[PDB]
Amino acid sequence: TYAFRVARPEDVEAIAAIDGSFTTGTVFQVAVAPDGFTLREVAVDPPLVKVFPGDRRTYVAVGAGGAVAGFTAVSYTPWNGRLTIEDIEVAPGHRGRGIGRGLMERAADFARERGAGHLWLEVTNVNAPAIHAYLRLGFTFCGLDTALYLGTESEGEQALYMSMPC
Amino acid sequence: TYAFRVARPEDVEAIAAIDGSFTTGTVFQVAVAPDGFTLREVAVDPPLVKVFPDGDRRTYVAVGAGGAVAGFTAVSYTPWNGRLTIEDIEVAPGHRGRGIGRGLMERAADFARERGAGHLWLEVTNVNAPAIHAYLRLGFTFCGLDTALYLGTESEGEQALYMSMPC
Ligand SMILES: CC(C)(COP(=O)(O)OP(=O)(O)OC[C@H]1O[C@@H](n2cnc3c(N)ncnc32)[C@H](O)[C@@H]1OP(=O)(O)O)[C@@H](O)C(=O)NCCC(=O)NCCS
Ligand SMILES: NCC(=O)N[C@@H]1[C@H](O)[C@@H](OC(N)=O)[C@@H](CO)O[C@H]1/N=C1\N[C@@H]2[C@H](O)CNC(=O)[C@H]2N1
Ligand SMILES: NCC(=O)N[C@@H]1[C@H](O)[C@@H](OC(N)=O)[C@@H](CO)O[C@H]1/N=C1\N[C@@H]2[C@H](O)CNC(=O)[C@H]2N1
């Protein structure tokens, strides 16, 4: 059984060690036309390995022994009532136990507390696993930026944008 | 007729007073599918009227023969992805269609090359067909959008379209 709280300074090491790295046999391929964009899930072989290089809050999911099993960092922009999920990670050995949903429910709580109109996140097109998890939690594609990762370690990837009403 | 320079503190009043408002007979309509987005230019009738609500930031001003600010562009460089963002570009009504827009974008391109940018990038509302057509002519293409960006704003019902070009 897992419990939730606001992250504390002593959690910083455990949070950094839940690093987000993953292997995927699928990516969301972006086809650019002059008049629009198509997202299509596509097989890759060999599997792709991805390693990552007041209105803010970080929540931590905690096991019975007090160990951080996941976290979410969120930020509110009053201008458009957007709660951004800046990061959400569940430790690999603690997946499929509802922690992801629980951290997103804490994000939804902060949203309602601030009077947000929608949840929003950025996810790289190669992160098919996270995209599938977000789809199941009720997020849909609201856009993308094919240029965001130009001149970065992630060049060749596209930033996909997902939202849901609060 | 028009010259360009870096904005000075005394220009702030003239820049704020420049009216970016426009009338359009067309909008770029955004169709959302589960698997993508289509942009299609479409007629609106009657015409839509739209009113708008440190070393790596710069504002340029276009100046008429009498020294009056006729247009401006605010730009910002992010070294992380080598992006020069055109944050704002506005030409005063009655100085439009005289090459000021191109001239301000050329100054943006100069700042890009000075900072070693890889691309120019801008946000434009889907209803701003005139600016979109001008950006297409200057060499920009659609690199994305955010259909949720204007939720809870005066612009709700519009979509943010994203355009880029290599430097
Ligand atoms: C982009 C903008 C600044 C251009 O203003 P401008 O000074 O009249 O533009 P220029 O005269 O430099 O023209 C630039 C190019 O775009 C073209 N262009 C401008 N409007 C066009 C239109 N509606 N259809 C087709 N081409 C168009 C020009 O003909 C020119 O191409 P050319 O060199 O082949 O002739 C325009 O958006 C504007 O009038 N500003 C109003 C404010 C605004 O739209 N704000 C931006 C949203 S934040
Ligand atoms: N859920 C967040 C997320 O996906 N993070 C990305 C993630 O860390 C890496 O992306 C891949 N593809 O690995 C990384 C590329 O090296 O880009 C991150 N995205 C960013 N960082 C930018 C700056 O904070 C400011 N301006 C932006 O617009 C932000 N966008
Ligand atoms: N060329 C710039 C531009 O298009 N400006 C828009 C413009 O001023 C209005 O939009 C329409 N459609 O009128 C306005 C809402 O009404 O939103 C602006 N866009 C923004 N402002 C946000 C903040 O700066 C911080 N974070 C963002 O992500 C920015 N996005």
Within chain B, where are the H helices?
12-16, 100-115, 129-138
How many domains does chain B contain in total? 1
Which residue of chain A is at minimal alpha-carbon distance from B28? A35
Whether the Cβ atoms of residue B36 and residue A36 lie closer than 8 Å to each other: yes
Question: Which ligand 1 atom is the nearest neighbour of the CA of B128?
Answer: 44
CA pair distance B158, B126, nearest whole angstrom: 6
Per DSSP, B80 falls in state: G
CA of B106 to the centre of ligand 3 (A): 22
Instruction: Residue A164: give the domain boundaries.
Output: 1-166
Contacts of B119 in chain A (CB under 8 A): 147, 150
A119 touches chain B (CB under 8 A): no
The two structure tokens encoding residue A4: 């939730």
CA pair distance A75, A11, nearest whole angstrom: 19
Residue A123, ligand 2, Cβ within 6 A? yes
CA B118 and chain centroid, separation? 18
DSSP character string of chain A: --EEEE--GGGHHHHHHS---EEEEEEEEEEEETTEEEEEEEEEEEEEEE-----EEEEEEE-TTS-EEEEEEEEEEGGGTEEEEEEEEE-GGGTTSSHHHHHHHHHHHHHHHHT-SEEEEEEETT-HHHHHHHHHHT-EEEEEETTTTTTSTTBTB-EEEEEEE-
Contacts of A154 in chain B (CB under 8 A): none
CA distances from A88 to A27, A28, A134, A161, B95 (A): 19, 19, 10, 15, 49
Resolution to 1 decimal place, in Å: 2.4
Whether the Cβ atoms of residue B105 and residue B90 lie closer than 8 Å to each other: no
CA of A121 to the centre of ligand 2 (A): 10
Contacts of B140 in chain A (CB under 8 A): none
Chain A interface, mutation test: which of B41, B85, B126, B149, most A Cβ atoms within 10 Å? B149
Whether the Cβ atoms of residue B126 and residue B161 lie closer than 8 Å to each other: yes
Torsion of the alpha carbons at B151, A85, A124 and B86, rounded to the nearest 10: 50
Q: With CB atoms and an 8 Å threshold, state whether B35 touches A37.
A: no
CA of A72 to the centre of ligand 3 (A): 27
Q: With CB atoms and an 8 Å threshold, state whether B144 touches A143.
A: yes
Instruction: Verify cis geometry, omega within 30 degrees of 0, for the bond prior to B46.
Output: yes
Contacts of B144 in chain A (CB under 8 A): 37, 143-147, 158-159, 161
CA of A87 to the centre of ligand 2 (A): 10
Q: With CB atoms and an 8 Å threshold, state whether A147 touches B83.
A: yes
- Output phi, psi for A132, to 5 deg: -60, -45
CA pair distance B154, B137, nearest whole angstrom: 29
Pocket test for ligand 2, best of A154, A155, A157 (most atoms within 8 A of CB): A154
H helix or E strand, kind and range, residue B6: strand B3-6
CA pair distance B118, A79, nearest whole angstrom: 30
Task: Output the residue whose Cα is nearest ligand 1's atom 13.
Answer: B99
Q: With CB atoms and an 8 Å threshold, state whether B36 touches A39.
A: yes
Q: What is the Cα gyration radius of chain B?
A: 16
CA pair distance B18, A127, nearest whole angstrom: 44
